[PDB]
Amino acid sequence: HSHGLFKKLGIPGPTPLPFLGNILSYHKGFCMFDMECHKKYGKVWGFYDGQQPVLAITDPDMIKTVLVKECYSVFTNRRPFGPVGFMKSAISIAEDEEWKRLRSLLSPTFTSGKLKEMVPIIAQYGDVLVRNLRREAETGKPVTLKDVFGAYSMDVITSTSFGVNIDSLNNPQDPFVENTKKLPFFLSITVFPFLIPILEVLNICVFPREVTNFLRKSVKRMKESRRVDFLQLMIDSQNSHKALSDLELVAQSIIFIFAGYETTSSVLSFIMYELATHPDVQQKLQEEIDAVLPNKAPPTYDTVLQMEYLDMVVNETLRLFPIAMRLERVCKKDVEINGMFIPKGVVVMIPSYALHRDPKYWTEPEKFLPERFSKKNKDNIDPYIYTPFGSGPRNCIGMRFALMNMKLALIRVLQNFSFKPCKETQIPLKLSLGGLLQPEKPVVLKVESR
Amino acid sequence: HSHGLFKKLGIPGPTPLPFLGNILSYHKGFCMFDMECHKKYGKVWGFYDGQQPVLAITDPDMIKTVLVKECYSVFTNRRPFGPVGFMKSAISIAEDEEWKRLRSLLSPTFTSGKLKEMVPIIAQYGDVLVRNLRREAETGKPVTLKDVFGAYSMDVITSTSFGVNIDSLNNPQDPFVENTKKLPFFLSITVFPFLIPILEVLNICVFPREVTNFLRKSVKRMKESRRVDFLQLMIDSQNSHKALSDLELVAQSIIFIFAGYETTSSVLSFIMYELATHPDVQQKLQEEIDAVLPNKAPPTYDTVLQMEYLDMVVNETLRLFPIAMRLERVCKKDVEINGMFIPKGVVVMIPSYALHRDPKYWTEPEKFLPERFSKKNKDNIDPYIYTPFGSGPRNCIGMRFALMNMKLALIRVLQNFSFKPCKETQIPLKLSLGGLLQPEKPVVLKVESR
Ligand code: HEM
Ligand code: HEM
Ligand SMILES: CC(C)(C)OC(=O)N[C@@H](CS[C@@H](Cc1ccccc1)C(=O)NCCCc1cccnc1)Cc1ccccc1
Ligand SMILES: CC(C)(C)OC(=O)N[C@@H](CS[C@@H](Cc1ccccc1)C(=O)NCCCc1cccnc1)Cc1ccccc1
């Protein structure tokens, strides 16, 4: 019963168990599962998330066909998941013409011109991050990066998307911060996908109605009271053609809070762990920042893009830690791409974590070597093997904003502080075996003032 | 032979002559021909440009279906014309997926953010226009508007699209101005459409190879030597997906020189004729400009959009003089829209001039009444009866730039000069019976200094 698909197609893979499929192999998580399957089976393999067949591909030509060439026609939507409730209008969750409509209505929001207008706002809380770090640096005590970076990442969101100016580390009782931090169920949905329609008619949603109703009623207070923020850029858009609905506008805001707060703060903790365990990379980066920005000059939009070694450090960290881990597209038609037939309903998956650490494409893939992305070596990197933001029409729409936000934080922090490991700094860093790419133990480092 | 199409469909219209069709009725031009056909036949009618059937529509619901609803699927391209040569890659001439590709690659070029960056450049030559007008104002002599406005409109193009700073009125020998002013055949093509492929294989083009080869070799001098100009915004775009080709990039530049130089200068001459023949409209506009910009303050992007009466004067002039005169779409499939069958190959036409002067939609349509577009009355205007920039996915892509350019010129001119008619001022203004909406005799007015 649906477990003989890859058997008939002649595709290798682990033998699935009834009902469960291959989900028991997730005990070490999927990044360790994708690496093992990439070795035992080769270029392609197939497993089952319960009854859902998943076809993994690693050929760069075939990846380009799925992500770019046959996107609008075949591989348009991602794996369906629920219950979402009213959040079906989210751009990352929307499907077919509904997504292509929202992707068009939100594309001008992420241009370089709008991002350059957001830099003064993002740089404002970079100084707040330094002041909070200095209070932890002048008092000798190891700092938890996920708490000090999460406070910064939240500060950027509340202003760049709603204009609410809060010091999350010093103002927790503000209704916005208290609700945006709210903010076993999912492995059950993986094995019980026939219970998603039950939770939808029961009005259960993966987001608590506490936060959504607050954000829905907080946005209408901001909309009816009213710039440079994502909210105003979406209000001006509603003034495919059919304009952004009121409910759709709030659904996109919540998606921007999830990614911006948790991706930006988690990658910064990964970067600072690599910079602390490699003092040579941190010193060379601090020398480039001081050369471009002397006398601790404030970073601007142009000065950030001028730093090449900073971009090399960010790109190398995203290679070791691609937080998305996997890229997925649902096959909607019986299509044959690159001489391989893919039936309808099969979930095509790209193991980004496994491809980023593949020794056949990277020399010493486990080492932190920023020289891979130097201007002399960046050309020999396949853009479909290294996909930290995906690829194609449905790649990360906030790639430029996320890169600009993290670099503005790293510049202002490395201008004032040098980071060194502690005795309790878990070296080497072990990744969590859950559903999010995060360190097992939180990263703790010693912050010293320059 | 192809002259019995509207006869079979039951569509009224003038009886066509063999070979010629109804082109002999163009002796008074098409705007007088569209008005007469709108009266004798009613809401729809059909005539023949030689052997080419042309179906005219005036119903606002059916116009929306052609221009917006059934654009990408049916009414996508305009009437084919030649010989164009390498200019087939022009966005206004491109067809089907080629146009939709160029429309996407050039859409971010015309955003409000890029236009706001062009205002300091456009406002620079507004002062040049005042200095040249003052030299003609201090010496009492009637000024020809088409020569003083054409000098300004050319000055805006050479800078906003290539960065070349020239005073066209004072520097005619510059290779750019001398070539951009270079810059019976077409009625023959209308009756002889089977000679277009002959001129294409003979390498004859509607543009002289003198200018095109110069512009093609002048752009490559500018490209290989290198901001804020249309050229750089297109160079950054090439750095549908498949990037702007080198030849395609030059073809779009020539199209921008045609529209920007000749539309902007011709509408300004129409506006100043209406302001001179209506001193009350000119005084009220000069009072609004002085109220927003006291002490002859320079106009900015925000201060231009703040002037409502200035927008009312511009919109009313474009009603009396829609320079495009007609909107045309080629019917590519046998489609039935709004209960009317339209065969394949028929040219659907929207008589913008006739609709703008239709007494059934406008009270006293021949009078210059800017109060029609007031904020209290602008709501009762159908956006598919008043189409000075077209409508739908293939409307005027430079609408915002053209409106901002003309208003910046009117503000800086009306800040320093008051315009009064002369004895040789042809009142009332008679339109030319040619192919371009221009006054028969050039508009001459008296310029006095404030
Ligand atoms: C280090 C930071 C980030 C990384 C590495 C990252 C990575 C990714 C990846 C891999 C995808 C899927 C691409 C694909 O399926 O081909 C994605 C999608 C997306 N990302 Fe990000 N992201 C980051 C931060 C952000 C931020 C700050 C935003 C702010 C709005 C954002 C908004 C989105 C959206 C809306 C989508 C879905 C787009 C669509 O489905 O059309 N991401 N991101
Ligand atoms: C008073 C000034 C102008 C007026 C009234 C005007 C009007 C129009 C109209 C009526 C159309 C056809 C719309 C349709 O077929 O539905 C058009 C097309 C177009 N206009 Fe303008 N125009 C003006 C100036 C400009 C300027 C300054 C540019 C600068 C680039 C420009 C670029 C274009 C282009 C590229 C197209 C064709 C777009 C396409 O085919 O996709 N126009 N214009
Ligand atoms: C672990 C498990 C697979 C059981 O579960 C999920 O991880 N489930 C997701 C569902 S679909 C998601 C789209 C998306 C998927 C994968 C990677 C990026 C994006 C979505 O809709 N938004 C995500 C927010 C935007 C973002 C995040 C990270 C990087 N770039 C952008 C995740 C999800 C769903 C709903 C709300 C938040 C997160
Ligand atoms: C009088 C007659 C019909 C025999 O002839 C033409 O009038 N022929 C045109 C051909 S198609 C044109 C697209 C277009 C058509 C009509 C109105 C606007 C645009 C084109 O391609 N570009 C035009 C330049 C952009 C522009 C102009 C005016 C207003 N807004 C934008 C005109 C033409 C062709 C080639 C080069 C220049 C002009």
PDB file of N, CA and C and ligand atoms in Angstrom, chain A residues 30 78-82 84 87 90-94 183 185-187 189-190 206-207 254-260 262-263 323-328 388-389 394-399 402 434-436, ligand 3:
ATOM      1  N   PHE A  30      17.151  14.344  10.750  1.00  0.00           N
ATOM      2  CA  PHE A  30      17.189  14.171   9.303  1.00  0.00           C
ATOM      3  C   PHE A  30      18.533  14.544   8.688  1.00  0.00           C
ATOM      4  N   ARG A  78       5.181  23.543  -1.850  1.00  0.00           N
ATOM      5  CA  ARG A  78       5.929  22.736  -0.902  1.00  0.00           C
ATOM      6  C   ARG A  78       5.024  21.667  -0.296  1.00  0.00           C
ATOM      7  N   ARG A  79       5.604  20.849   0.576  1.00  0.00           N
ATOM      8  CA  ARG A  79       4.850  19.783   1.220  1.00  0.00           C
ATOM      9  C   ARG A  79       3.722  20.375   2.060  1.00  0.00           C
ATOM     10  N   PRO A  80       2.479  19.934   1.870  1.00  0.00           N
ATOM     11  CA  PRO A  80       1.378  20.488   2.666  1.00  0.00           C
ATOM     12  C   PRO A  80       1.491  20.073   4.123  1.00  0.00           C
ATOM     13  N   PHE A  81       1.172  21.010   5.014  1.00  0.00           N
ATOM     14  CA  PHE A  81       1.210  20.743   6.443  1.00  0.00           C
ATOM     15  C   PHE A  81       0.129  21.567   7.123  1.00  0.00           C
ATOM     16  N   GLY A  82      -0.380  21.042   8.232  1.00  0.00           N
ATOM     17  CA  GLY A  82      -1.405  21.722   8.982  1.00  0.00           C
ATOM     18  C   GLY A  82      -1.453  21.271  10.425  1.00  0.00           C
ATOM     19  N   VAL A  84      -3.296  24.998   9.791  1.00  0.00           N
ATOM     20  CA  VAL A  84      -2.736  26.344   9.700  1.00  0.00           C
ATOM     21  C   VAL A  84      -3.816  27.365  10.032  1.00  0.00           C
ATOM     22  N   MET A  87      -3.872  31.017   8.378  1.00  0.00           N
ATOM     23  CA  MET A  87      -2.524  31.214   7.868  1.00  0.00           C
ATOM     24  C   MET A  87      -2.280  30.506   6.544  1.00  0.00           C
ATOM     25  N   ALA A  90      -0.492  32.671   4.008  1.00  0.00           N
ATOM     26  CA  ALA A  90       0.924  32.985   4.123  1.00  0.00           C
ATOM     27  C   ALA A  90       1.650  32.608   2.838  1.00  0.00           C
ATOM     28  N   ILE A  91       2.594  33.460   2.427  1.00  0.00           N
ATOM     29  CA  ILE A  91       3.269  33.258   1.146  1.00  0.00           C
ATOM     30  C   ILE A  91       4.046  31.948   1.147  1.00  0.00           C
ATOM     31  N   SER A  92       4.661  31.604   2.280  1.00  0.00           N
ATOM     32  CA  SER A  92       5.391  30.347   2.375  1.00  0.00           C
ATOM     33  C   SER A  92       4.463  29.141   2.405  1.00  0.00           C
ATOM     34  N   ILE A  93       3.188  29.338   2.744  1.00  0.00           N
ATOM     35  CA  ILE A  93       2.227  28.242   2.785  1.00  0.00           C
ATOM     36  C   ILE A  93       1.277  28.252   1.589  1.00  0.00           C
ATOM     37  N   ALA A  94       1.086  29.397   0.937  1.00  0.00           N
ATOM     38  CA  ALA A  94       0.164  29.484  -0.186  1.00  0.00           C
ATOM     39  C   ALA A  94       0.640  28.617  -1.348  1.00  0.00           C
ATOM     40  N   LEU A 183       5.005  32.201  20.169  1.00  0.00           N
ATOM     41  CA  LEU A 183       5.743  33.333  19.608  1.00  0.00           C
ATOM     42  C   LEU A 183       5.274  33.634  18.188  1.00  0.00           C
ATOM     43  N   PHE A 185       4.084  16.925  18.630  1.00  0.00           N
ATOM     44  CA  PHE A 185       2.895  17.218  17.836  1.00  0.00           C
ATOM     45  C   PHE A 185       3.156  17.025  16.348  1.00  0.00           C
ATOM     46  N   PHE A 186       4.355  17.376  15.886  1.00  0.00           N
ATOM     47  CA  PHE A 186       4.650  17.400  14.460  1.00  0.00           C
ATOM     48  C   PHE A 186       5.087  16.047  13.917  1.00  0.00           C
ATOM     49  N   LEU A 187       5.797  15.246  14.715  1.00  0.00           N
ATOM     50  CA  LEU A 187       6.077  13.876  14.300  1.00  0.00           C
ATOM     51  C   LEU A 187       4.804  13.042  14.257  1.00  0.00           C
ATOM     52  N   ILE A 189       1.852  14.405  13.258  1.00  0.00           N
ATOM     53  CA  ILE A 189       1.261  14.837  11.995  1.00  0.00           C
ATOM     54  C   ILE A 189       1.950  14.159  10.819  1.00  0.00           C
ATOM     55  N   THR A 190       3.256  13.902  10.937  1.00  0.00           N
ATOM     56  CA  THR A 190       3.975  13.209   9.872  1.00  0.00           C
ATOM     57  C   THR A 190       3.437  11.796   9.672  1.00  0.00           C
ATOM     58  N   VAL A 206      -1.675  25.482  14.298  1.00  0.00           N
ATOM     59  CA  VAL A 206      -0.312  25.358  14.800  1.00  0.00           C
ATOM     60  C   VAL A 206       0.133  26.623  15.515  1.00  0.00           C
ATOM     61  N   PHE A 207      -0.514  27.752  15.242  1.00  0.00           N
ATOM     62  CA  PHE A 207      -0.243  28.929  16.052  1.00  0.00           C
ATOM     63  C   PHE A 207      -1.357  29.111  17.067  1.00  0.00           C
ATOM     64  N   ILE A 254       3.028  37.697  10.301  1.00  0.00           N
ATOM     65  CA  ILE A 254       3.416  36.664  11.257  1.00  0.00           C
ATOM     66  C   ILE A 254       4.561  35.826  10.705  1.00  0.00           C
ATOM     67  N   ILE A 255       4.525  35.522   9.405  1.00  0.00           N
ATOM     68  CA  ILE A 255       5.606  34.763   8.780  1.00  0.00           C
ATOM     69  C   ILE A 255       6.923  35.524   8.880  1.00  0.00           C
ATOM     70  N   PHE A 256       6.878  36.850   8.725  1.00  0.00           N
ATOM     71  CA  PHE A 256       8.094  37.654   8.816  1.00  0.00           C
ATOM     72  C   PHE A 256       8.643  37.695  10.238  1.00  0.00           C
ATOM     73  N   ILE A 257       7.781  37.513  11.238  1.00  0.00           N
ATOM     74  CA  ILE A 257       8.239  37.494  12.622  1.00  0.00           C
ATOM     75  C   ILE A 257       8.937  36.177  12.935  1.00  0.00           C
ATOM     76  N   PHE A 258       8.445  35.070  12.374  1.00  0.00           N
ATOM     77  CA  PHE A 258       9.063  33.771  12.626  1.00  0.00           C
ATOM     78  C   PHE A 258      10.482  33.718  12.074  1.00  0.00           C
ATOM     79  N   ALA A 259      10.626  33.951  10.768  1.00  0.00           N
ATOM     80  CA  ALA A 259      11.934  33.848  10.128  1.00  0.00           C
ATOM     81  C   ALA A 259      12.918  34.858  10.703  1.00  0.00           C
ATOM     82  N   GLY A 260      12.536  36.138  10.720  1.00  0.00           N
ATOM     83  CA  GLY A 260      13.488  37.181  11.068  1.00  0.00           C
ATOM     84  C   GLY A 260      14.044  37.047  12.474  1.00  0.00           C
ATOM     85  N   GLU A 262      14.110  34.172  14.489  1.00  0.00           N
ATOM     86  CA  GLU A 262      14.732  32.900  14.839  1.00  0.00           C
ATOM     87  C   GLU A 262      15.851  32.486  13.897  1.00  0.00           C
ATOM     88  N   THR A 263      15.763  32.831  12.612  1.00  0.00           N
ATOM     89  CA  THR A 263      16.872  32.545  11.709  1.00  0.00           C
ATOM     90  C   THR A 263      18.053  33.471  11.981  1.00  0.00           C
ATOM     91  N   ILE A 323      20.158  26.411   7.840  1.00  0.00           N
ATOM     92  CA  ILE A 323      19.117  26.240   8.852  1.00  0.00           C
ATOM     93  C   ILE A 323      17.860  25.609   8.270  1.00  0.00           C
ATOM     94  N   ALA A 324      17.613  25.792   6.972  1.00  0.00           N
ATOM     95  CA  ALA A 324      16.469  25.132   6.353  1.00  0.00           C
ATOM     96  C   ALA A 324      16.702  23.635   6.202  1.00  0.00           C
ATOM     97  N   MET A 325      17.968  23.217   6.098  1.00  0.00           N
ATOM     98  CA  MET A 325      18.369  21.813   6.056  1.00  0.00           C
ATOM     99  C   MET A 325      17.910  21.155   4.758  1.00  0.00           C
ATOM    100  N   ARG A 326      16.634  21.305   4.411  1.00  0.00           N
ATOM    101  CA  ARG A 326      16.077  20.655   3.235  1.00  0.00           C
ATOM    102  C   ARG A 326      15.269  21.631   2.389  1.00  0.00           C
ATOM    103  N   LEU A 327      15.276  21.391   1.081  1.00  0.00           N
ATOM    104  CA  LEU A 327      14.402  22.072   0.135  1.00  0.00           C
ATOM    105  C   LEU A 327      13.417  21.054  -0.418  1.00  0.00           C
ATOM    106  N   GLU A 328      12.138  21.421  -0.468  1.00  0.00           N
ATOM    107  CA  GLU A 328      11.098  20.478  -0.856  1.00  0.00           C
ATOM    108  C   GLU A 328      10.131  21.117  -1.839  1.00  0.00           C
ATOM    109  N   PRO A 388      21.842  27.992   0.487  1.00  0.00           N
ATOM    110  CA  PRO A 388      21.396  28.406   1.826  1.00  0.00           C
ATOM    111  C   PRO A 388      20.078  29.159   1.813  1.00  0.00           C
ATOM    112  N   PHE A 389      19.679  29.717   0.669  1.00  0.00           N
ATOM    113  CA  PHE A 389      18.407  30.417   0.530  1.00  0.00           C
ATOM    114  C   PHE A 389      17.533  29.790  -0.550  1.00  0.00           C
ATOM    115  N   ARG A 394      10.784  30.488  -6.045  1.00  0.00           N
ATOM    116  CA  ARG A 394      10.322  30.348  -4.670  1.00  0.00           C
ATOM    117  C   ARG A 394      11.485  30.232  -3.687  1.00  0.00           C
ATOM    118  N   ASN A 395      12.581  30.936  -3.957  1.00  0.00           N
ATOM    119  CA  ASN A 395      13.687  30.987  -3.016  1.00  0.00           C
ATOM    120  C   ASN A 395      13.349  31.947  -1.878  1.00  0.00           C
ATOM    121  N   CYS A 396      14.306  32.145  -0.972  1.00  0.00           N
ATOM    122  CA  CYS A 396      14.095  33.040   0.159  1.00  0.00           C
ATOM    123  C   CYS A 396      13.909  34.476  -0.314  1.00  0.00           C
ATOM    124  N   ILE A 397      12.709  35.026  -0.112  1.00  0.00           N
ATOM    125  CA  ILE A 397      12.436  36.389  -0.547  1.00  0.00           C
ATOM    126  C   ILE A 397      13.110  37.412   0.359  1.00  0.00           C
ATOM    127  N   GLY A 398      13.526  37.008   1.557  1.00  0.00           N
ATOM    128  CA  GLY A 398      14.187  37.916   2.472  1.00  0.00           C
ATOM    129  C   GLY A 398      15.677  37.665   2.577  1.00  0.00           C
ATOM    130  N   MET A 399      16.269  37.133   1.506  1.00  0.00           N
ATOM    131  CA  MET A 399      17.697  36.827   1.515  1.00  0.00           C
ATOM    132  C   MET A 399      18.531  38.087   1.711  1.00  0.00           C
ATOM    133  N   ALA A 402      17.997  39.449   5.251  1.00  0.00           N
ATOM    134  CA  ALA A 402      18.631  38.626   6.275  1.00  0.00           C
ATOM    135  C   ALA A 402      20.146  38.792   6.260  1.00  0.00           C
ATOM    136  N   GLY A 434      16.421  17.675  16.684  1.00  0.00           N
ATOM    137  CA  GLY A 434      15.011  17.989  16.553  1.00  0.00           C
ATOM    138  C   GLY A 434      14.616  18.334  15.136  1.00  0.00           C
ATOM    139  N   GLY A 435      13.710  19.301  15.007  1.00  0.00           N
ATOM    140  CA  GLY A 435      13.221  19.719  13.707  1.00  0.00           C
ATOM    141  C   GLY A 435      13.796  21.039  13.236  1.00  0.00           C
ATOM    142  N   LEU A 436      14.525  21.716  14.116  1.00  0.00           N
ATOM    143  CA  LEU A 436      15.168  22.984  13.805  1.00  0.00           C
ATOM    144  C   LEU A 436      16.677  22.832  13.927  1.00  0.00           C
TER     145      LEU A 436
HETATM  146  C1  LIG C   3      10.334  20.303  11.083  1.00  0.00           C
HETATM  147  C2  LIG C   3       8.977  20.285  10.338  1.00  0.00           C
HETATM  148  C3  LIG C   3       9.310  19.994   8.875  1.00  0.00           C
HETATM  149  C4  LIG C   3       8.156  19.129  10.935  1.00  0.00           C
HETATM  150  O1  LIG C   3       8.211  21.500  10.486  1.00  0.00           O
HETATM  151  C5  LIG C   3       8.500  22.700   9.853  1.00  0.00           C
HETATM  152  O2  LIG C   3       9.607  23.196  10.085  1.00  0.00           O
HETATM  153  N1  LIG C   3       7.455  23.464   9.317  1.00  0.00           N
HETATM  154  C6  LIG C   3       7.611  24.543   8.317  1.00  0.00           C
HETATM  155  C7  LIG C   3       6.290  24.528   7.378  1.00  0.00           C
HETATM  156  S1  LIG C   3       6.171  25.683   5.885  1.00  0.00           S
HETATM  157  C8  LIG C   3       7.325  27.180   5.997  1.00  0.00           C
HETATM  158  C9  LIG C   3       8.166  27.341   4.697  1.00  0.00           C
HETATM  159  C10 LIG C   3       9.636  27.004   4.861  1.00  0.00           C
HETATM  160  C11 LIG C   3      10.047  25.683   5.002  1.00  0.00           C
HETATM  161  C12 LIG C   3      11.383  25.324   5.173  1.00  0.00           C
HETATM  162  C13 LIG C   3      12.369  26.300   5.217  1.00  0.00           C
HETATM  163  C14 LIG C   3      11.989  27.631   5.088  1.00  0.00           C
HETATM  164  C15 LIG C   3      10.645  27.978   4.919  1.00  0.00           C
HETATM  165  C16 LIG C   3       6.489  28.420   6.405  1.00  0.00           C
HETATM  166  O3  LIG C   3       5.274  28.486   6.142  1.00  0.00           O
HETATM  167  N2  LIG C   3       7.068  29.494   7.074  1.00  0.00           N
HETATM  168  C17 LIG C   3       8.502  29.566   7.457  1.00  0.00           C
HETATM  169  C18 LIG C   3       8.962  30.988   7.886  1.00  0.00           C
HETATM  170  C19 LIG C   3       9.924  31.651   6.875  1.00  0.00           C
HETATM  171  C20 LIG C   3      11.366  31.156   6.878  1.00  0.00           C
HETATM  172  C21 LIG C   3      11.912  30.286   7.831  1.00  0.00           C
HETATM  173  C22 LIG C   3      13.249  29.875   7.760  1.00  0.00           C
HETATM  174  C23 LIG C   3      14.050  30.353   6.718  1.00  0.00           C
HETATM  175  N3  LIG C   3      13.561  31.195   5.780  1.00  0.00           N
HETATM  176  C24 LIG C   3      12.266  31.569   5.876  1.00  0.00           C
HETATM  177  C25 LIG C   3       7.993  25.937   9.010  1.00  0.00           C
HETATM  178  C26 LIG C   3       6.953  26.969   9.490  1.00  0.00           C
HETATM  179  C27 LIG C   3       5.572  26.952   9.226  1.00  0.00           C
HETATM  180  C28 LIG C   3       4.712  27.942   9.699  1.00  0.00           C
HETATM  181  C29 LIG C   3       5.203  28.991  10.463  1.00  0.00           C
HETATM  182  C30 LIG C   3       6.556  29.033  10.742  1.00  0.00           C
HETATM  183  C31 LIG C   3       7.401  28.037  10.261  1.00  0.00           C
END
